[PDB]
């Protein structure tokens, strides 16, 4: 134990497989090919976003929110175009990485997710916490990957989002390890530790998770609209794809009383870019 | 406005003081001048605790420690106990808002304390700011290390003021007088033991590590014990090495470790039912 606690590791790990370290750098490199994925039932339901296609619909959301909240502050984030995932930590160790699936049942892809270098294997405190976000492939890497799909006699990936989702849904961990996939976490799925979405993001960063930094707090739809317009202009130059901007009521208690439909928060909407 | 942040973060000084003396209502929260001699007060402002302090039931013998473990096991079949030192010091509550220390307060009558915020700023171990913008109240003891006490007493002697009887008199004496510059010269320190605002972690032990992440000093001298017998060994070893500790202690506080368990036992009128302090002489 004290052995591994401090190429040698590999030998010791293949010897007593019954006792690899959670923090082992060995989980970042090629491991097993898996049978299939187990199905996993989500402890906390992974809801969806209501969509908006126009400034008027954003006006309409804002008016619906101010039916219950007098002075809302909104946080507008990017909607990353990738594969949506959920990560469960127990005692500060990542135990289950799972696809959103239908919002109730997903595929347990935990082994595959350990080879996304951005994902923390352990946390700095002994937490139980479930986080959500999107796993994706940078535009930079896409061209390379698609060359590798051809040389292996497989269909090229239609775009980065498909390349990431098809990487995480195939069965060989060692393939995940050779593509450079990354993450942006946007939320706790387990009850929020902090008072505000903007504080949750800063907290998640304190835990070791990558949080997307292009985001603002805004008081009205006019400030929001500009940010969506600045996003629309810069988006050819981002190093990942997006498919929109998410606007949320910042404060937890405000979100609380707005509540949820059977599908989505009442306190959030997702703007979608024209074609 | 901007030379400030640059000057404060670099320095983290001559100019800075000058700008600060120029524009007093823009001295930044983590300015290093908060550590140095500053204002004198005329008297302390009152402050009403948002979370009032309670007290501790006490025990004075092994038998009594056993009766405690028995009352606890009426409710929780398999308790874990955390065992901590009860430091001989002065009780402080520290309230942060937006990550900044905004009040430091004495126990007072339990609902209303004395605002000693400026004096506490000169205690170096206390963070002026946190690594996130939290609203949080933390509660601990401010004490004087025995080594400082022996220095300060030598200083008072050469300056012909009378010596403090013990580190506890010395600590209450420094913090309760009105000159921040006296606090700065005297080398006080802290150990925090709880969140006074509602716990963020689900065990005392996870609670303690959490505070350490936030920049607070926490006494390493503790254990997680599964029955009165490891507890009693720990206290005996503590009694024995007591003379060799860098600070004075008033005993051992034994607490039911996990929050759900503390919540099921609850409190009497004045005190938790989930905690006891064993008193040494
Ligand atoms: N201005 C402050 O020092 C202040 C106050 C509250 C939170 N924070 C957060 O902490 C960071 C600075 O580090 P520390 O406060 O841990 O020294 C800031 O960049 C900020 O995000 C800072
Ligand atoms: C509040 O719920 C959500 N918030 C989100 N935020 C970002 N940035 N991206 C998402 N995909 C997202 N999805 C959901 C369901
Ligand atoms: C459970 O409440 C308490 N716990 C404590 N813990 C330690 N270590 N020291 C104290 N002085 C203390 N005081 C109280 C009221």
From Swiss-Prot, chain B:
It comes from the Bacteria. NAD(+) binds at residues 55-56, 84, 107, 141, 255, 279. The active site is at 86 (n6-amp-lysine intermediate). Coiled coil: none annotated. DNA ligase that catalyzes the formation of phosphodiester linkages between 5'-phosphoryl and 3'-hydroxyl groups in double-stranded DNA using NAD as a coenzyme and as the energy source for the reaction. It is essential for DNA replication and repair of damaged DNA. Belongs to the NAD-dependent DNA ligase family. LigA subfamily. This is DNA ligase. The chain holds residues 2 to 304 of 652 of the full protein.
């Amino acid at each position: 134990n004290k052995r591994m606690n401090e190429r040698e590791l590999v030998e010791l790990e293949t010897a007593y497989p019954e006792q690899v370290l959670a923090d082992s750098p060995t989980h970042r490199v090629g491991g097993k090919v898996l049978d299939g994925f187990e199905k996993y039932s989500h402890q906390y339901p992974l809801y969806s976003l209501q969509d908006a296609f126009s400034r008027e619909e954003l006006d309409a959301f804002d008016a619906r929110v101010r039916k219950e909240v007098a002075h809302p502050t909104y946080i507008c984030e990017l909607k990353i175009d990738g594969l949506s995932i959920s990560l469960t930590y127990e005692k500060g160790i990542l135990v289950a990485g799972v696809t959103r699936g239908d919002g109730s049942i997903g595929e347990n892809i935990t082994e595959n997710l350990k080879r996304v270098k951005d994902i923390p294997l352990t946390l700095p405190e002994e937490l139980d916490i479930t986080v959500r976000g999107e796993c994706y492939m940078p535009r930079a890497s896409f061209d390379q990957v698609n060359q590798a799909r051809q040389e292996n006699g497989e269909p090229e990936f239609a775009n980065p989002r498909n390349a990431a989702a098809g990487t995480l849904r195939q069965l060989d961990t060692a393939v995940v390890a050779k593509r450079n996939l990354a993450t942006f976490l946007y939320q706790e799925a387990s009850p929020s530790t902090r008072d505000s979405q903007e504080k949750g993001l800063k907290y998640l960063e304190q835990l070791g998770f990558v949080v997307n930094p292009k985001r603002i707090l805004a008081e009205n739809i006019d400030e929001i609209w500009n940010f969506i317009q600045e996003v629309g202009q810069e988006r050819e130059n981002l190093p990942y794809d997006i498919d929109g901007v998410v606007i949320k009521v910042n404060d937890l208690a405000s979100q609380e009383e707005l509540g949820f439909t059977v599908k989505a928060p009442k306190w959030a909407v997702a703007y979608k870019f024209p074609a």
